[PDB]
């Protein structure tokens, strides 16, 4: 699984690398046109590009103007993502450019390889982990900045808040993935956990609440419980029977 | 019809000529091959008893000269040579009169198969790939690799669908999804100059894969097929010709080698997914009849 994957271990070496998730690029609301058929209406989307080492999230907001006059949007979205990711990389100083880009969906490989031909030293690879990055719009400050956009724009976030002052990148990425996996599993339950104590505030400049080290342990335990009970119902298994490597496989989404 | 005499045959050998083959045993008298349709290109090839030794041979054109075979005890190979003096060659051809023991190239009154397999293969196409030397004929063997394999070389035009050459900057999606720019501007207009040269290399790739077992040649053949089919815009005369070219290749392919000479991915794309799938009418028909396991 993930815990015996040399690939997974590599995320936390000293190479610069970026995850790209394109799941939220093309988003719609569902309607009906005069012919009675299904009608879709694009709403703003985003590219989730993350440095798992620093927590820096380059959130490219995909304003609905970029679909105007275009067709086959579900195919185009992947090519647009690739276009933007490559533009990002071009914008960066050389020693800040990633040695590797990991796409969450294999359908991104051809479009990104083609767009990155000017960077032959940047390796594009898929992952066998089903990472929960699509749940990114369950984070209110991300959802809000995307929906309020009136034009294409890039917004930088640190998705680890101030955690790296106290824990390692591995621990912060594991925390991030746990939170997103919980929000993906059931957003209401996951929010009830995060927001149960309103005296622990989400700072204006943060995405997550200001838990103490002590409090994060409890929160992480509750998130784990939520995720594993859903898996447990899905397969009719007691949580307590799951091994630690199994739990990580569940959380990271090992194929 | 022409003759390729042998001035000696001192060593056992299995000999191929175009699609035919025969054995010459230890101490068997043998003076060559006659009744060869003049045509415009042929291959003669050789295999000795050690299965581990290479198959080697020569592509040649009877129209260009008087060619013959002679064993060379120095390199230990049958070699092709040219006789520029017509009278000396005539003497070689008629040496020994009724005592001549020769193979007759089968009559092909309605087996235009060899013509169809080599329609666009002329010696200049071959020399592009197998570097020209002092001879009017071109040596090839089963140990040769392509420059692409390398990354005695087969210098095919490199086709790479994910390369700057295939993709104009700013046309990424356009050029990856529709290969027309790459086929028409880069390959046909830029490199091959015309479709006959393109088809010639495609046919030679097939023949080398079939005769000398070179996997890189099979890769090149498939890539040149895929390039055409994955282009929305192809000159109509190419489109109409491609189906016939492939039809005879599939027809002639040794069925024992079909597993390693035929790429499932490329054929399913070309026949069922590509822009030009409807232009492969007979090729689809022969594939379905002869190799249904590939579809």
UniProtKB/Swiss-Prot annotation, chain A:
UniProt miscellaneous comment: Present with 468 molecules/cell in log phase SD medium.
Effect after changing residue 22 to A: Reduced growth at 30 degrees Celsius. Strongly reduced growth at 16 degrees Celsius. Strongly reduced growth at 35 degrees Celsius
UniProt-reported outcome of changing residue 22 to N: Reduced growth at 30 degrees Celsius. Strongly reduced growth at 16 degrees Celsius
Function summary: Functions as a scaffold that mediates the ordered assembly of spliceosomal proteins and snRNAs. Required for association of BRR2 with the spliceosomal U5 snRNP, and the subsequent assembly of the U4/U6-U5 tri-snRNP complex. Functions as a scaffold that positions spliceosomal U2, U5 and U6 snRNAs at splice sites on pre-mRNA substrates, so that splicing can occur. Interacts with both the 5' and the 3' splice site, as well as the branch region. Has a role in branch site-3' splice site selection. Associates with the branch site-3' splice 3'-exon region. Also has a role in cell cycle.
Residues included from the entire protein: 1836 to 2087 of 2413
Organism, as annotated: Saccharomyces cerevisiae (strain ATCC 204508 / S288c) (Baker's yeast)
Region RNase H homology domain, annotated ranges: 7-255
Effect of residue 21 to N: Reduced growth at 30 degrees Celsius. Strongly reduced growth at 16 degrees Celsius
Stated name of the protein: Pre-mRNA-splicing factor 8
UniProtKB/Swiss-Prot annotation, chain B:
PTM-bearing positions, type Phosphothreonine: 252
Matches recorded under CDD domains: Aar2_C, Aar2_N
Effect of residue 231 to A: No effect on interaction with PRP8
GO BP term, example: spliceosomal tri-snRNP complex assembly
Residue(s) carrying Phosphoserine: 231
Role of this protein: Component of the U5 snRNP complex that is required for spliceosome assembly and for pre-mRNA splicing. Involved in splicing pre-mRNA of the A1 cistron and other genes that are important for cell growth.
Family stated for the protein in its record: Belongs to the AAR2 family.
Stated name of the protein: A1 cistron-splicing factor AAR2
Organism: Saccharomyces cerevisiae (strain ATCC 204508 / S288c) (Baker's yeast)
